[PDB]
């Protein structure tokens, strides 16, 4: 296959999950149904990357109303969290205290309420099967398992699913996830409320606090996914690009491309080593300028970023940065004016 499709396409980071999304489309599901169904599958096949214990954002475009929206379902610091709770990378990276309140399931639910066509339960069905029957460990997960061999092998609760005779599974070996299968089934039947204010809730709280965390039932009961009706956008030629603003990196992306659009890149830009070299140099300098401004970004509900984001999405501001890009040299850190306060 070349993967050019006449009618519909799903691009995911596991084949089986792309197929699961595609099948939902074929059965009448909206773009959102396919995405939710694929995501539940990636949560299984790339369990190291994402899943119902985490959070997500969706950028959704409706070709009928021609409106784009964003769904914010990223995790939130628990009610008991505070600025100085951690004193080492190790405390913020490992154990229950490192856990933020998961938003994933509230995020699927909100997207589905707004855009779904297949029943909720249908979205989980093929992933329930997959987790019970098992699948060969793919390349990515195999690499992750290798990378984290030590911690996995010394933690019985992880080795339980991720090992074979106390040693981490390898590429091609069968991984089964029988407890997640049950959990996905509960979610399919009882709905999102099972996670957040229902039959899974007390267990979640108990797992997190047992590992030293501080998430409580109230945190889960309180979690809300958020509809953002006006996502960030920038104009590029005849096109608009929709992307999430803070707390995500739309503003960084916007600024990178706005700096670069003023150079009018084309296939010529890469045709000779002279031009190609300059082109890539320009790219790297735009990265540098864009990341300088990124240190001002934060959750817009707690930090006023209105004007930081105005600047980052402004073409004039990008033109001012493009003019400081020297064609023959890069510069020291301070040249790009990274700021840590305003």
């Amino acid at each position: 296959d070349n993967h050019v499709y006449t009618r519909a396409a799903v691009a995911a980071d596991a084949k089986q999950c792309s197929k699961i999304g595609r099948d939902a489309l074929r059965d009448g599901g909206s773009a959102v149904d396919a995405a939710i169904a694929a995501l539940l599958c990636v949560g299984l096949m790339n369990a190291h990357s994402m899943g119902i214990g985490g959070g997500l954002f969706l950028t959704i475009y409706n070709s009928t109303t021609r409106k784009a929206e964003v769904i914010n379902a990223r995790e939130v610091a628990p009610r008991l969290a505070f600025a100085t709770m951690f004193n080492s990378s190790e405390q913020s990276q490992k154990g229950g205290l490192s856990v933020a309140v998961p938003g994933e399931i509230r995020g699927y639910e909100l997207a589905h309420q707004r855009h779904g066509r297949l029943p909720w339960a249908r979205l989980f069905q093929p992933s329930i099967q997959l987790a019970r029957q098992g699948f060969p460990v793919g390349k990515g997960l195999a690499a992750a398992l290798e990378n984290k061999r030590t911690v996995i092998e010394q933690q019985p609760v992880l080795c339980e699913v991720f090992c074979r005779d106390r040693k981490v599974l390898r590429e091609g070996e069968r991984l089964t996830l029988p407890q997640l299968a049950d959990t996905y089934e509960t979610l399919a039947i009882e709905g999102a409320q099972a996670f957040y204010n229902g039959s899974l809730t007390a267990q979640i709280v108990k797992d997190i606090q047992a590992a030293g965390g501080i998430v409580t039932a109230e945190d889960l009961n309180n979690y809300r996914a958020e509809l953002i009706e006006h996502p960030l956008n920038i104009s590029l030629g005849d096109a608009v690009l929709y992307m999430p603003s803070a707390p995500l990196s739309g503003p960084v992306l916007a600024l990178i491309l706005n700096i670069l659009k003023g150079y009018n890149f084309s296939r010529e830009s890469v045709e000779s080593p002279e031009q190609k070299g300059l082109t890539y140099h320009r790219i790297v300098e735009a990265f540098r300028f864009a990341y300088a401004k990124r240190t001002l970004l934060g959750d817009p509900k707690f930090v006023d970023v209105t004007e930081v984001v105005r600047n980052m999405t402004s073409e004039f501001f990008a033109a001012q940065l493009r003019a400081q890009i020297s064609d023959d040299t890069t510069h020291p850190i301070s040249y790009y004016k990274p700021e840590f306060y305003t």
């Binding site: 519909a8 899974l200 023959d328």
Partner: protein, 189 residues
């Protein structure tokens, strides 16, 4: 992190990036539910933790109860002036997500590479701090030279830079690509 791109038959589209943060998140798995819990608190800045030599804490991104941590994720949909979807794109790979996403867009929209090439094409990354330009192993070495003679210190990534999934509208319909760096593959009809 995982990025997913979807175009439906009616031309509607979804771009979705999802994460539990690091590999296996917190390393806390429930023995009862099997849920593997995120370690998303690590994306906050903390006054007592220095990450990079010489990089100070970012007060805009400190922990507060109810606050969301800053993210590099950027799930994007490019729509044409006529209201039709042109590109659905995003990435995984921590602070490399944003540069990788910019590259996929540049490669396709400006250099005119098809979506598969746009996804497979070698990448590079600079995030200002640290003060280094990371290039993939198979980058055109005329690029490496062009950067080094302009005083960039370059280094080669030991693995790869980011993971991109994308769909682009073409003459033949919707062209889809999954990044071979992680081994995904698209599906459609």
């Amino acid at each position: 992190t995982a990025h997913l791109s979807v175009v439906a038959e009616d031309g509607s589209a979804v771009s979705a990036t999802s994460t539990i943060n690091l590999y296996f998140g917190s390393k806390v798995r429930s023995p009862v539910s099997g849920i593997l819990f995120n370690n998303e608190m690590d994306d906050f800045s903390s006054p007592s933790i220095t990450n990079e030599f010489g990089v100070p804490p970012s007060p805009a991104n400190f922990i507060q109860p109810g606050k969301q941590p800053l993210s590099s994720m950027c799930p994007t949909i490019m729509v044409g002036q006529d209201g039709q979807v042109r590109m659905v794109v995003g990435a995984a790979g921590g602070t490399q997500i944003t540069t990788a996403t910019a590259l996929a867009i540049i490669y396709n929209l400006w250099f005119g590479y098809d979506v598969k090439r746009a996804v497979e094409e070698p990448r590079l990354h600079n995030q200002l701090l640290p003060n280094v330009t990371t290039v993939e192993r198979n980058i055109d070495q005329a690029v490496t030279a062009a950067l080094e003679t302009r005083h960039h210190h370059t280094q080669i990534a030991s693995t790869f830079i980011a993971v991109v999934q994308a769909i682009v509208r073409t003459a033949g319909g919707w062209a889809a690509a999954s990044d071979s760096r992680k081994g995904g593959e698209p599906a459609g009809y």
